[PDB]
Design a protein around this ligand. Sequence first.
Ligand SMILES: *[C@@H]1O[C@H](CO)[C@@H](O[C@@H]2O[C@H](CO)[C@@H](O[C@@H]3O[C@H](CO[C@H]4O[C@H](CO)[C@@H](O)[C@H](O)[C@@H]4O[C@@H]4O[C@H](CO)[C@@H](O)[C@H](O)[C@H]4NC(C)=O)[C@@H](O)[C@H](O[C@H]4O[C@H](CO)[C@@H](O)[C@H](O)[C@@H]4O[C@@H]4O[C@H](CO)[C@@H](O)[C@H](O)[C@H]4NC(C)=O)[C@@H]3O)[C@H](O)[C@H]2NC(C)=O)[C@H](O)[C@H]1NC(C)=O
Ligand SMILES: *[C@@H]1O[C@H](CO)[C@@H](O)[C@H](O)[C@H]1NC(C)=O
Ligand SMILES: *[C@@H]1O[C@H](CO)[C@@H](O)[C@H](O)[C@H]1NC(C)=O
Length: 273
Amino acid sequence: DGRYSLTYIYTGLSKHVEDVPAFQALGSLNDLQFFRYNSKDRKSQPMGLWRQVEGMEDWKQDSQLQKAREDIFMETLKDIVEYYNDSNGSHVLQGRFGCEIENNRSSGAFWKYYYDGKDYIEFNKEIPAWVPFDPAAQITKQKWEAEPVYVQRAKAYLEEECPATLRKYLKYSKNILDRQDPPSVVVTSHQAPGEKKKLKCLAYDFYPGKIDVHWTRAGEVQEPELRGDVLHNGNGTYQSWVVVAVPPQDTAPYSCHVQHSSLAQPLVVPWEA
Ligand SMILES: *[C@@H]1O[C@H](CO)[C@@H](O[C@@H]2O[C@H](CO)[C@@H](O[C@@H]3O[C@H](CO[C@H]4O[C@H](CO)[C@@H](O)[C@H](O)[C@@H]4O[C@@H]4O[C@H](CO)[C@@H](O)[C@H](O)[C@H]4NC(C)=O)[C@@H](O)[C@H](O[C@H]4O[C@H](CO)[C@@H](O)[C@H](O)[C@@H]4O[C@@H]4O[C@H](CO)[C@@H](O)[C@H](O)[C@H]4NC(C)=O)[C@@H]3O)[C@H](O)[C@H]2NC(C)=O)[C@H](O)[C@H]1NC(C)=O
Ligand SMILES: *[C@@H]1O[C@H](CO)[C@@H](O)[C@H](O)[C@H]1NC(C)=O
Ligand SMILES: *[C@@H]1O[C@H](CO)[C@@H](O)[C@H](O)[C@H]1NC(C)=O
């Protein structure tokens, strides 16, 4: 088949305000987020299109898995902070890990951490072993490879467990991930006195995100003055817009051109001056 990826992002704060949960976890399949979890509610909740999907995962049991990871992740953050002697400062530890398959064949995986935005430590499953980037990561590298077993386990997760889990979610998610929802396009305009007229083209409610939206002046592609696009996760749809500035006297016709995988033919919307 095609490419599919399973991704997780853990974020921990040494010091956080009351609303703000100290630990936050989120998972994604391709471009969409299918679940979340935070240190406050301590609950693994499905998201977007998966909110209606049942049997894919035991959210109760996963909530326990996260609670575990949390304790561990946060403790690591604790140690690091201790190293730099700033136990009472605001710091962040971010973990990102996952795998991906292409043609039903494992095609990669990763596991990396970021302390305060900087690269901290990263796992190389081909060695297998961790790679330090930050001085403290050396201590952490130490601990994490204390027993020969550890590195083996890590390699296993990425090469075995992760992909396995990806496989199962696919059984419940392929559809969501495979959608070919065409974009609706709308042309709009703005005009302030003493300024060039601005034409805006908006493509929306489409999926996948890959799309081509551009303006043409009498048939010649026009470089946009402003671009912009968004993903609405709970929804599963994208929105991409482009704005051109049309000179005062210009009479050349302006049309918006939208190309997308779900469309057999490019969609063209002219601007009726
Ligand atoms: C996923 O989740 C998304 C976000 O959570 C959500 O976003 C919202 O998407 C809808 C479209 O799906 C969008 O709606 C507006 O629709 C305008 C056209 O209306 C059509 O269609 C509606 C129903 O779809 C009908 O009720 C109308 O009658 C009308 O029908 C058309 O009627 C004409 C007659 O003249 C016929 O010729 C047509 O054939 C007929 N078509 C159809 C299909 O029936 C559209 O023009 C709106 O454009 C917006 O963007 C322009 C440029 O930015 C603005 O100038 C314009 O004012 C609109 O701005 C919105 O204004 C709001 C209030 O100020 C803002 O809060 C919004 O942020 C702003 N939206 C945008 C995109 O800028 C517009 O498309 C909503 O606007 C959009 N809202 C947001 C916040 O994104 C999706 O719907 C969800 N999709 C799914 C599948 O679940
Ligand atoms: C932390 O403070 C101690 C004692 O002042 C100092 O020796 C050490 O270098 C500091 N640790 C780091 C990682 O800078
Ligand atoms: C994906 O690969 C696994 C292992 O080779 C296999 O069990 C499964 O049937 C494959 N899926 C498809 C759709 O072929």
